[PDB]
Design a protein around this ligand. Structure first.
Ligand code: ZN
Ligand code: ZN
Lengths: 51, 245, 112, 87, 104
RNA sequence: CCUCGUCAUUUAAAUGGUGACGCGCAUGAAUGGAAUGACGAGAUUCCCACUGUCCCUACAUGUAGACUAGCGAACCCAUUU
RNA sequence: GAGGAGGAGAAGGGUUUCUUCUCAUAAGAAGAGUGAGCCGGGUCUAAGCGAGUGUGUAGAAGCAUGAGCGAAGGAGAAACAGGUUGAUAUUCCUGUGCCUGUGCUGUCGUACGGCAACGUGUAUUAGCUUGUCGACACGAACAUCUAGACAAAGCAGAAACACCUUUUCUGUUCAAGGGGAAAAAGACCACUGAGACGGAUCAUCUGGCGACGUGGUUUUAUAUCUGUGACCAGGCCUGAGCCUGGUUUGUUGAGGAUGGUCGUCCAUGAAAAGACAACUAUAUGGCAGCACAGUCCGUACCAACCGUAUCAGGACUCCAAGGUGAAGAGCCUCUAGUGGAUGUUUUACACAUGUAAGGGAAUUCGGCAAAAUGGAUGCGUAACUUCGGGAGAAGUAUUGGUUCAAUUGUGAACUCAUUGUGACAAGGGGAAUCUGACUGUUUAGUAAAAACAUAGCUUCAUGAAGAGAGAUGAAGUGAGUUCUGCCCGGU
RNA sequence: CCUUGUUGCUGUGAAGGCUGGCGAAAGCCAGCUGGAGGCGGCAAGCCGUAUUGAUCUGCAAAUCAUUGGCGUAAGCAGGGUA
């Protein structure tokens, strides 16, 4: 909801910046072997436990 | 089995709370005082009313609590200690009060603040003064006779609020309000209606105790239920009391 | 006294010691300001309300921002409002004592 | 007033609780609700605030008393004994 | 008929949350807040409310003029005219008995 | 227990109900005994009203079901029946 | 269908919100978006928790005292209208304000009046002490105010017209701050001097401790005015600006606010921070202008929450129109909001429902299920009973529309093709027996009961208390009425 | 245990009060006023008697329909604490 503590807000801000795919240029690099970022999440499928 | 109801209710988190209390009840310590009665008040757990008193100790005003005797009023001046007059509601040394008189809030030893008679409607009777030993015999409301030294103080009158037990509580809710502040279990479920894990009277295909209900004084605590160390039982007449002053 | 401090608004706690050598200039005007923001959202504010918008260091407060602007850019300030955004950036909005000067300072500084 | 032959103030309870118990309660219930005479001002304006405390609606004096009546039987007698001690 | 929302705070209808309905120049019906009522001084002897003094809440009372908070007599607010008449007489009459008991 | 005890009343007809009787396998007095009022989604018998419960079944309505487009599983299984 | 499938907050979720593009779609990718001295947190204290210290333990636990902590719905200085974005707004912009402090310049101050009830005067710090405010249960009736809703007249625009109609619909606005009545309800002051008697309430009641009367003093709302104009409706033109209105009266009325009364209780219904008055000393203090200051954290959105989900379940609160009727009941409408596995007339057996000749429980363990009765007004009401009840006992009759009398009691006439609480809503009743006195409670998920509880009755132990025999604990029986015989051999 | 929220419409008509009549008294009989109660019929709600109804590869690891019980109170509920 609208009321939040400072500690809860920083957790949300960090959880929101980490939630991104692999940038499209990295895929062209000779040494790079990852397909998809397995740390990506959806609000419909997991809980953060920020509480 | 498990621990019985009687033990659980004696643990510390079940003791009566004091948050609504007015203060500790008892006489001032000084040899002589003149006091004024400031207010007469009800205290949440107690049926007898309390009186707030005001008296000087050095230059400063100080406050105390007495149990109210019947017939005081707000604004009355009262006299405490040696050289007080025999007037209703004064406090005096016991040796000054004549035989056959009725007293309340009696000290068992000097400067204890007053114990003995403190419940609504009660009083004690002065039955004898011994001029050699300086003892006095008082008859307590249980019928017991006890000896106290002449230097102890006492309040002249009967405790306010008498007659309260005349009116029956006809309903369950009326009993609820009376026991809400006491330590006894209400409502009280009978032991014969429990299972044998919960109470020594539990179990069986008919509701019965099955063993005698009179138990020893030295029996172990988690089974000491029923009539503890009874001398006799039943509705028959007893015997003559033996009496000395 | 030790407590978990979960309801607190300031995340720092400890009082700070002296040191044998101290850092040259300290928390100072050129650490406080990061950049002015110039886009279609900001442009309206310069044109209508005489206010600039800036990104500022997390450690900064209203009094410090007021001083730093008057030191770097030179116009006098009426008000400062502050906003912690969902992207982890502290924004400051500064209104100038005379309007019109907002378009002068913005253009000199290359914000606009 | 007095529209009932026997039941008096206890008519509020209908047919519930026993007959014998109601006629004990009745004595106390009639006594509680009355106004009584003030010792200080003579008027009939004294009523009960709470058990043991009685109060005058004109002059404001408060006095200790019984649970259902201002002066109890033991008090009416004992008050006299004290007056004799003063002689 | 237009219906309202709570603009600020909580919906939970406690003593600190009284509201009234008001019509604005723009022809809207809106809720607006209400401050609690104040009780003024009662006499220290008898419980009667003192004449000549205003009733307000502690913060608002302190911002009024001193004349709103007293009467010009021996006890300002504090006590009523009858109780001071009694006090003045009592102190006089007691001193006269002491005078007599000293002279006799 | 014997037992569907005997006598009366209720029905055309009563292993039922109510009233009587009592050597009661093995009733009974705060392990509480006995007679009523008001109040039970408590257990039991009868009468009046009422009816597809029944004699004895018939017709009609909505929604599923049969057939059709799109989508699309599971229990179970030595199997030749 | 206003106890909404409407509009908003809390707990919980965390970008789900806005724009663009692509299908990959309850799918992705890239950007953008939350602004405060006056709203809430950071303060105070409840029940309570506790570092350290003392005592104890192999170390612990525990016990005594006690810094600090403990409520986003208890106490708690000061703000409101109207505008603006794709997305924020009592936070931004315009206007008018307020609280707490700081500094400059002017301008005044060092006291009086009334028999009194008390008034005039915007007034400094500091301290004892005494008191007040903060600061408080439930229930009932009666006043007064404000939202709201009606009805007439005026104007502006709409709807409807084969016929009829001045028929019908929508509008007619005024914030915080400043100034301010009459009224009603209570206190009190001066004169006066009252009864087998006057005054007064819906109801209690009230007076020589001073009635009625005649003149005053004070406490508590609201209407009205200002708030410098905003905002709305309509017309003319238009890639813009002008012009015209926003006027009067009556009835009712809270599910909000306030006031003084009355009732109930073996139940009498928080603290503290922070304030104020009197008394005593001490005095360069009041007001007007102008200027300066007020840090830190939260602020988007939810039909998106918990149940493995896009789940008929669960989940704390606020606002609330017209008719019918006793009634935020059911039924019907205005404001605001809403919807998809496709076609086919589709047997039998189902699941939700209707109706039935003659008979009327013959059915079945058993009237299980269904039918019948139903609101208001009147007449008339038994055994038994703790005299309160039983009791709506039972049993019977009336009820629509129209046009009149009469004024709360109701009467009378005329009229209709099955009759009238016409739909919706809405008791079946009596005679007996067993059992528990009554309202209440229980096996969340096969048992709601005769079981548990309960008021009352009886027994037992104690003079120890932060409690003191009308007390504090332990057992048994189960309201009331009427009784409660005999046995101490065994344990 | 501490701090809070939540009662709308109706029936019956106790205590107390005022008039009129009857009586030598004591105190009896009418009509009106007043509004008590773990008191009656209902609403919002809280619950769980029957159909041994529907469902039993469920909408659901306890739900749905009609029918029922209480509803001015030993009633229901949020947060803090034990
Ligand atoms: Zn008096
Ligand atoms: Zn006074």
């Amino acid at each position: 909801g609208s009321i939040k503590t400072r500690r809860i807000k920083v957790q949300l801000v960090s959880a929101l910046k980490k939630n991104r795919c692999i940038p499209q240029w990295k895929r062209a690099c000779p040494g790079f072997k990852q397909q998809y970022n397995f740390t990506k999440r959806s609000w419909k499928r997991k809980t953060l436990k920020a509480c | 089995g498990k621990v019985i109801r009687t033990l659980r209710l004696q643990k510390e988190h079940w003791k009566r709370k004091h948050h609504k209390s007015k203060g500790i009840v008892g006489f001032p310590t000084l040899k002589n005082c003149e006091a004024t009665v400031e207010k007469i008040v009800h205290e949440s757990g107690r049926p007898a009313p309390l009186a707030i008193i005001n008296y000087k100790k050095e230059e400063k005003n100080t406050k105390g609590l007495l149990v109210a005797i019947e017939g005081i009023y707000e604004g009355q001046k009262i006299q405490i200690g040696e050289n007080a007059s025999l007037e209703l509601g004064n406090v005096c040394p016991i040796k000054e009060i004549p035989e056959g008189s009725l007293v309340s809030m009696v000290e068992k030893k000097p400067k204890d603040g007053g114990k003995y008679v403190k419940s609504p409607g009660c009083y004690a009777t002065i039955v004898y003064h011994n001029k050699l030993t300086n003892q006095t015999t008082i008859k307590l409301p249980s019928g017991e006779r006890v000896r106290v030294t002449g230097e102890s103080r006492a309040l002249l009158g009967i405790i306010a609020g008498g007659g309260k037990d005349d009116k029956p509580l006809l309903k369950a809710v009326n009993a609820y309000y009376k026991y809400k502040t006491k330590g006894k279990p209400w409502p009280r479920v009978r032991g014969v209606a429990m299972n044998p894990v919960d109470h020594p009277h539990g179990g069986g295909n008919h509701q019965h105790v099955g063993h005698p209900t009179t138990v020893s004084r030295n029996a172990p605590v988690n089974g000491r239920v029923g009539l503890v160390a009874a001398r006799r039982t039943g509705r028959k007449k007893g015997s003559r009391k033996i009496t000395v002053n | 006294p030790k407590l978990n401090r979960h309801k607190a608004s300031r995340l720092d706690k400890k009082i700070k010691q002296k040191k044998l050598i101290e850092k040259p200039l300290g928390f100072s005007s050129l650490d406080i300001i990061k950049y002015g923001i110039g886009h279609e959202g900001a442009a309206k504010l310069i044109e209508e309300a005489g206010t600039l918008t800036f990104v500022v260091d997390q450690r900064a407060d209203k009094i410090n921002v007021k001083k730093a602007f008057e030191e770097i850019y030179g116009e006098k300030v009426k008000k400062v409002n502050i906003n912690n955004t969902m992207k982890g950036v502290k924004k400051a909005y500064i209104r100038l004592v005379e309007l019109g000067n907002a378009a002068v300072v913005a253009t000199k500084a290359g914000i606009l | 007033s007095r529209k009932t032959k026997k039941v008096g103030i206890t008519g509020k309870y209908g047919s519930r609780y026993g007959s014998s118990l109601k006629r004990r309660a009745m004595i106390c219930m009639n006594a509680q609700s009355k106004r009584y005479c003030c010792s200080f001002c003579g008027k009939t304006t004294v009523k009960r605030e709470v058990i043991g405390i009685w109060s005058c609606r004109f002059c404001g004096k408060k006095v200790s008393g019984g649970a259902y009546v201002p002066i109890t039987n033991q008090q009416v007698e004992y008050k006299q004994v004290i007056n004799r001690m003063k002689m | 008929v237009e219906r309202q929302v709570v603009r600020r705070g909580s919906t939970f209808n406690t003593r600190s949350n009284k509201r009234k309905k008001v019509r604005t120049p723009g022809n809207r019906l809106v809720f607006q807040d209400v401050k609690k009522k104040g009780k003024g001084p009662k006499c220290g002897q008898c419980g009667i409310k003192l004449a000549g003094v205003k009733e307000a809440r502690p913060a608002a009372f302190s911002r009024m003029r001193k004349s709103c908070r007293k009467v010009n007599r021996i006890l300002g607010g504090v006590q009523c005219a009858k109780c001071v008449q009694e006090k003045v007489l009592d102190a006089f009459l007691n001193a006269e008995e002491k005078r007599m008991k000293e002279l006799e």
